[PDB]
Symmetry: D2
Subunit: 220 residues, 4 copies
């Protein structure tokens, strides 16, 4: 499962532990019970979501592999209840790719110059910063110093291990119109993979707990 985001980004599912029944099993230990049948198990997921019983959902875990601009990674990495491993800016080899917004990214905004010129101006400063970085590297400046001139739209990569409860909090905050459009796009991809692996939890989440707007207006 890999979903392309923006001009060069992606969200890829690396691994997953459990499914909707993992939350059913974790919740049923409360009354000294285990699993039952599909209809009763789906009814239990809805019940847990409708009444705020969130801890059973922590037993479902995902590992994603994400390629995203640093300005998006910075917002994402604010979610502390998760595990991260990212490309090292000090020692890693990079692809040196950058997010260049298309003119449509500026639709709705009254700009003094055409949106096409905004796209061109961003490519131009990206090209100059990248060339300056290459000149510094070629002259023996260490990468940890030379890379500080690179713009915030430079692409990075990281592994993200997160349980369904923390993933639903991430979706509440990022799959929402108050979040930056670029991270909303990534949150739609995370929601799509979550829905495929945990359909009952995802449907119950949208029905009872989801506080955002875009997941109820856009089919994922």
């Amino acid at each position: 499962m890999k979903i392309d985001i923006l001009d060069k980004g992606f969200v890829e599912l690396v691994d997953v532990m459990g499914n909707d029944l993992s939350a059913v099993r974790a919740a049923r230990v409360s009354f000294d019970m285990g699993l039952k049948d599909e209809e009763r198990d789906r009814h239990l997921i809805e019940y847990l979501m409708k009444h705020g019983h969130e801890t059973p959902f922590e037993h479902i875990v995902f590992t994603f592999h994400v390629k995203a601009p640093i300005f998006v990674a910075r917002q994402w990495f604010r979610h502390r209840i998760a595990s991260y491993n990212e490309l090292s800016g000090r020692f890693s080899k990079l692809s040196y790719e950058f997010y260049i917004p298309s003119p449509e990214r500026l639709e709705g905004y009254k700009t003094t110059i055409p949106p096409e010129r905004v796209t061109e101006k961003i490519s131009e400063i990206v090209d100059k910063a990248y060339r300056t970085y290459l000149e510094l590297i070629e002259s023996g400046v260490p990468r940890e110093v030379a890379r500080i001139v690179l713009p915030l739209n430079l692409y990075t990569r990281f592994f993200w291990t997160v349980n369904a409860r923390s993933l639903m909090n991430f979706l509440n905050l990022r799959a929402d119109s108050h979040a930056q459009w670029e991270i909303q796009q990534y949150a739609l991809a995370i929601a799509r993979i979550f829905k495929e692996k945990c359909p009952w939890t995802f449907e119950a989440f949208l029905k009872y707990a989801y506080k955002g707007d875009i997941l109820k207006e856009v089919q994922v």
Copy 2:
């Protein structure tokens, strides 16, 4: 599937696991824009991360256990906050008996004025009285959440424990050690055994370079 019996009626059972040693190799190699390599280089990387303190790659390995343990042991266990728990509700569940009765051997090395067999019998006796008092209160309409407060700390509970390998290794450092209570040491030995089966390279490197306790090496 993997199940280890602990104490007289307890157990530790493996419910699920995400990943293996290569999950930590993959997570660490993203730093240099690399992925997996060959068996020898990958095992060498696990030992390198362990000995130099690069712990975050081990968070991408996750386990779910199903545990049955006495409440005095669960109270110590539940202090490990970097993990997920779901436990039996004493407020809303039928009490299916089950208490940890130490065997006479638990008192070996202690000079007691009564035989250790009598200690075992005295513990079974007070457990039986507390349990029947609890049943009498329940039968008379006292809610479970009030009636259960008379039950002793050796009553068995059950719980699901979801924990990543980094937090699991912190748990082993603290509990798979002679300073921890013998009863939780037994449970930590079962946790270590299952971890070793699923992540042999991480477990071997952990014992060799990072493990601070004593009993796993004995």
Copy 3:
């Protein structure tokens, strides 16, 4: 600030870092604007779900509570705890004995006074068995396992206002056990005294429980 709970328990404030203005400063990101504008900002953050500024307000409490209550409390992982050791600490060997009023509303086969007496009686027998084991040379870590769940323990609880408000949402509520709801009312009272604007805005916009809106705190 100390508030008595149950028959022998308490919640006592040990220390506090910050007040309502600590959340205002964190939200504006400035170590340096008008009481009305600052109170308006607290209500704005509470009403729109901007929770992280409230993490910069921290409390330390000293709690004396029965073990069954402490087990429920210690499920709140986003906090710091230090508790009396069951293996090595000296204990007062006090126990929570519910008063007959705890059984009001329940149709019991025996008078609620008899339930109170039966609980004190099994507590006394368990305590005497524990003493017999200790006197015979059984270590405390083994002998104490016969003690009932109503035995009082003590702990330090260091928690920030965001995690404290999650605790109030879950424990200052009729679905939580009455015994922990009493402790959560005391925590709410101390929180209100130290952070009146955050507490008032919390009740008005974010609080999901019932009892803090029905009982004067």
Copy 4:
């Protein structure tokens, strides 16, 4: 207490809850004898009883380049509130390394030229950003051309146990020189507020190198 770091950065202490005695009281579960209390701090540090140190909490106000903040914000057992790149007003200041930052490196051009080339690209990126903003481009889009050396500001609330983990990892020669400088300032403030815990930490638990070679 405010300490200047780099060319335009700083670490400032906003608030603190407790001192060494907060860990002593937490360990004993009790709410004064200097020698016995200091002996207890060393005992806990030496035997790995870390949880009593969580009852000491600090709030700092930090101004640091984004490349340093990204490394810092990897410490999840802490609270942060940062300037919003999407909506906040900014000073628009940037870390320009001085020629001394390139000491020991064999460069094909003088280290002074590296400093000049960095100031030059920063100035061009900043001017491009201003041109976009002036033409109506939202800040959340225009800001993506700004370099990683742009200074951000944040509040950091962290307990002493997590702060000691941060010092173990960042007040060390394997960490990037820039974040080592900030970790030295944090160590200095921590030492002033918790002298016994800081000294016991260096003696028994500290795994880094620079705090045992440099007086803070």
